[PDB]
Symmetry: D2
Subunit: 289 residues, 4 copies
Amino acid sequence: NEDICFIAGIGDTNGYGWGIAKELSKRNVKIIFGIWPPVYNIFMKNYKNGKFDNDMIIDKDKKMNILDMLPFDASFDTANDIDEETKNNKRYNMLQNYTIEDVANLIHQKYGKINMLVHSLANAKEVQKDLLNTSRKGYLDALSKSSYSLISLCKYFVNIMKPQSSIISLTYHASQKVVPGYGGGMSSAKAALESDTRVLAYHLGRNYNIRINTISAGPLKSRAATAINKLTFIDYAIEYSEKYAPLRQKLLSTDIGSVASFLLSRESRAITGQTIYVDNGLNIMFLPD
Amino acid sequence: NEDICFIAGIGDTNGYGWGIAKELSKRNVKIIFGIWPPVYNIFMKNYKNGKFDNDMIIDKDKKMNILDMLPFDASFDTANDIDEETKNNKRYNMLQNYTIEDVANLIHQKYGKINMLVHSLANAKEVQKDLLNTSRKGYLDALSKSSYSLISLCKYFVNIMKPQSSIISLTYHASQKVVPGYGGGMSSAKAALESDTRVLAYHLGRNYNIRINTISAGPLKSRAATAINKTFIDYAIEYSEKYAPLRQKLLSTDIGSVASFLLSRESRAITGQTIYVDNGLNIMFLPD
Amino acid sequence: NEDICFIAGIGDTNGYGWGIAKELSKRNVKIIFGIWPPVYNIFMKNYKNGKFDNDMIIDKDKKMNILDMLPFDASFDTANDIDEETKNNKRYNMLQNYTIEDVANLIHQKYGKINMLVHSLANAKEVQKDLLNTSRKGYLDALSKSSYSLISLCKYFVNIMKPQSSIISLTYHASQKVVPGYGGGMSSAKAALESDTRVLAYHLGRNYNIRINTISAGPLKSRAATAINKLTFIDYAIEYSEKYAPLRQKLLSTDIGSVASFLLSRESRAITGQTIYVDNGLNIMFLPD
Amino acid sequence: NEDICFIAGIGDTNGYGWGIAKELSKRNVKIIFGIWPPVYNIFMKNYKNGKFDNDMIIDKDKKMNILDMLPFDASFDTANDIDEETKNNKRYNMLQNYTIEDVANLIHQKYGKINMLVHSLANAKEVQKDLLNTSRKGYLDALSKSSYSLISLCKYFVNIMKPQSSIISLTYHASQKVVPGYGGGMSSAKAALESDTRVLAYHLGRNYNIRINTISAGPLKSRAATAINKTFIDYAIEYSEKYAPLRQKLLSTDIGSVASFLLSRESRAITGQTIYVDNGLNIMFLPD
Ligand SMILES: NC(=O)c1ccc[n+]([C@@H]2O[C@H](COP(=O)([O-])OP(=O)(O)OC[C@H]3O[C@@H](n4cnc5c(N)ncnc54)[C@H](O)[C@@H]3O)[C@@H](O)[C@H]2O)c1
Ligand SMILES: NC(=O)c1ccc[n+]([C@@H]2O[C@H](COP(=O)([O-])OP(=O)(O)OC[C@H]3O[C@@H](n4cnc5c(N)ncnc54)[C@H](O)[C@@H]3O)[C@@H](O)[C@H]2O)c1
Ligand SMILES: NC(=O)c1ccc[n+]([C@@H]2O[C@H](COP(=O)([O-])OP(=O)(O)OC[C@H]3O[C@@H](n4cnc5c(N)ncnc54)[C@H](O)[C@@H]3O)[C@@H](O)[C@H]2O)c1
Ligand SMILES: NC(=O)c1ccc[n+]([C@@H]2O[C@H](COP(=O)([O-])OP(=O)(O)OC[C@H]3O[C@@H](n4cnc5c(N)ncnc54)[C@H](O)[C@@H]3O)[C@@H](O)[C@H]2O)c1
Ligand SMILES: Oc1cc(CCl)ccc1Oc1ccc(Cl)cc1Cl
Ligand SMILES: Oc1cc(CCl)ccc1Oc1ccc(Cl)cc1Cl
Ligand SMILES: Oc1cc(CCl)ccc1Oc1ccc(Cl)cc1Cl
Ligand SMILES: Oc1cc(CCl)ccc1Oc1ccc(Cl)cc1Cl
């Protein structure tokens, strides 16, 4: 009764955020979507015109229930951080309460305390460039949006969460092993996110009795994954994974969703600070056959 | 759905095996216990006498359903492998079909194909000596009983398992970081088990679509734990409860619920992994 | 003959930069110091007034030879990055050619190509705050100065280095395991630096035949280490290390120096992308005695 | 300074043992070879006949100085441990004092205390089977000969070593990541060796101030390498030279110079570590 989850980073039904929502919905968790303002209106219109109705089907006797859909920009910690230009930008100007602190405030006012938090977002202006050719601005952009955003979400949401709550994010193995193509400091940001997950596990665990983990997911053809193409990257990764992983089956977003759902529930009470691989075991291989 | 799990390594209700059994029971999984022969009759006697009745309560509605309880010795792959001294032992002489292969055949003959396998056992005759003073015989005993036994279990059990079945074992972080009193080559055996888990994941995944993972548990005051010296387990528990990120008592069923998840279809995309279930203790460097 | 090493991050004789210089000097490597402008003048005056003469003694029949001492600020990639305020700041206004590109240009013009590069610097405005209380600005500051600086040094110095050159930086185990007190996103920056070391190893190795590694050093009572005190941290770490490390001896900066010197020489030709622990084995322990 | 190193595991000049010997020789370290008895006489014969003369050249001025060459079997801890079948073997019958303890005593009696120890040997009778089809006897053989042998070497050699001495062994990344043809429990043995290296580092560091590390080498076309199947070693080398960050031929002396550094006082603050000497291949995820 009243498991409520905020999922930060959903833009359509093709990413891991949607897979996580669907699996949580199956367990009767109420879902709140945090949607980045550049794609918020297109998301809502698609939703309203029933474009997602097929994608919301679960048991065939069961359909996803979404409690709310909120504009959310993980770039901004508080209203005071929003630069005048963004505030007046065409896509932002008609939206309110979209900073990290404001969304936490909003959620709490509307629904009270929550017990489940999902960071399912990343961004990097220079993802198309190799690390060596990444500018300082681009690298800091990657760390700001992909890594720091997790820390800030935690700082503001822990006030609206019950003890024994659970927090997950999503990472990629390029943090630990070299993946050519994963540029722009994205590798660096995932390494930071994985290390920050431990440090946060310590603070949140001791001061709040809240857990935090990260899922290192295998390749999924999401909207963001396609934007790694330069001049494709995700097709190569998928093909390589389906060919060489211990488990040669197609990796689904709901495969990640059911792990997320376990880590968010009380069943994972003794697990915290961990990077959990959900990648058909690809990470354990050294040399291909 | 008619799931069956063989749990190898139950001697009483104070260890991880029991906790795993309880949590699986919540999911209506049928449970079969593999019990080490030296403690088989005492176990059956305590069970008959009702000593375990309270430990078997799953909640208001439910009692643990235990399908069967069989003698099982991981020292022996097949009937041919038992020596005369064991053949002649008081405790073994009155039992049979307790080698790894015999138990696979016996389960398959009685109940058919299973789909869940749990390795929750270890042994090391020189556990109380430090690695440097461990003999070759002692070291190889630790590896034989604590590591090779997992390979052999897999080798014989795959024949009686369904596709998409799942397997787990238990390990300890002494494989990766030094724990002074974890002697007798137990640290070595755990290191080998964690690596074996990967290699097996490759073979079982490609050839049978079967998953295997290992749970690295924090300290639990079980029978075997009380055998280690610095008492060791009392120190480990106090340290964990003082310094772990989550300052709560680690329960066998905390491991049980993770095991149950790893053994279900929910974790279909996870294989070859060491999953830490230790209140986050493994992430700490410097005690604060 | 003409092994030349640029050591970026030396402010006095109490840190690892000095230890590395001393060990390299023992192998007749010519040393160039890159000195942060806020402490450059005080460094030079101390040096001139012979305050370091004791510290430069090697064999007792041998004294360190320093080829040059250059103002260096790893915050700035090129002259064009320097903000008007810094340029006119009291401590910067009389200094020139101190950006990463300008120092590379300068070194090359003056001495030709070099074959050894040391990143021995870190910085974080909010090191005194726990990760959870670190602001976005502070976290980005830590990543900018401690992590990105390595990438930029590489990008500009690879043009002035010979094939088969070697590059090292210094890291700390807080990247992998939680160390309370190592705040301000310093942990996050070290995690990034260690992951960037791999990615760079790949690019530099393939395109230039240049190696790069990082040394994860144990605790040393350097000037920066003392600035971690809040309201001390380094005294605790030293005491803990001397008590519980497999090797219970005092960790010296020249202990790190002799490893650095090995990794910079041709003897380590087949080692790249690695994090090498020089910490009396402390990292291998789980529970104290 | 009068340094002496025992190198256990030299059979010819094509392996890592020889490379380590050569590089140490550059530093004027006196070298003692431990040679597996089945290949001892053939080795001595090739040496006498000058087959190794060119491989022994250190440069313009220097030839490798080899202090002694002794039969050494890591299967056996003491004289008591040899079975009748080995006692009776053609190759062994004409040799003696080749158990681990006997060799420590023999070296100490002839040359005094040493300060450097190299473990450069492995064996696994079922290397050509995959882990899942490896027998208990085969698995334990791999662990006995490839892992326990390091512990035993340390146990017997510490008595004859100086304080601040240093010890190294060789491992392979198959302990950490799956390499399909690395069978017979060799992956398990390497996992145990890397963990054992840590535990030993604790014991030897606190008790004797002695260091121990392990070098994880990339592929070298040695005698033993040619025993593995997918040829395996030909594939590994081609893959490494194509995908490693450094695209250069890995030489035994590339491992040698790192070994020499780890065995010197230069690395006094390094212990219990796995050091990768593989042209950076281990850092790659996806072949590009
Ligand atoms: N797709 C893969 O193959 C893959 C593999 C490993 C990890 N991941 C991780 O999973 C997570 C989700 O990625 P995805 O693959 O589902 O792609 P996706 O496009 O479905 O998810 C990215 C979402 O984040 C949102 N977003 C971007 N910047 C934001 C900001 N500042 N504030 C709020 N929202 C913002 C975007 O609108 C987008 O909807 C990412 O962290 C990614 O690194 C993905
Ligand atoms: N207890 C802890 O603190 C702890 C921490 C980490 C990991 N573990 C692991 O969890 C597993 C379960 O142990 P536990 O802690 O529940 O103690 P336990 O005594 O409850 O379980 C060990 C069981 O293994 C059985 N066994 C021993 N030798 C056997 C053989 N040759 N064949 C068959 N069975 C044999 C014993 O009868 C015993 O019941 C072990 O593998 C242990 O390494 C335990
Ligand atoms: N001291 C330790 O215990 C310890 C342990 C592990 C790692 N390290 C690492 O070793 C490295 C050196 O630290 P240290 O301990 O020798 O302290 P230190 O003060 O001797 O070294 C830091 C130096 O970097 C310089 N610096 C700071 N910002 C700079 C910039 N933007 N451009 C150029 N130079 C700048 C400072 O002037 C200072 O001299 C750091 O990377 C640190 O993280 C230190
Ligand atoms: N060759 C490679 O590609 C490679 C890669 C990584 C690690 N390694 C490791 O390097 C080490 C050296 O092997 P190598 O590659 O030089 O091959 P090698 O054949 O040159 O060395 C192995 C030696 O071990 C000896 N040996 C075998 N059983 C023995 C016993 N019971 N007692 C004493 N000696 C015994 C053999 O006589 C042989 O000379 C091995 O431990 C191996 O695991 C090799
Ligand atoms: O992390 C990712 C890892 C993979 C490996 Cl298959 C594919 C997509 C990913 O997600 C992103 C990658 C880059 C950027 Cl800029 C944003 C995002 Cl959400
Ligand atoms: O693996 C273990 C780790 C700990 C750390 Cl708390 C405690 C108990 C353990 O289990 C055993 C330990 C030694 C032996 Cl001989 C058998 C077993 Cl079942
Ligand atoms: O990295 C470090 C690790 C330790 C652990 Cl003993 C001590 C000092 C360190 O160096 C710094 C720490 C913080 C900041 Cl702001 C700058 C620097 Cl140079
Ligand atoms: O460890 C090894 C790893 C590789 C990967 Cl290139 C090649 C050779 C190796 O050495 C052995 C391998 C198997 C056996 Cl039975 C003995 C030895 Cl000495």
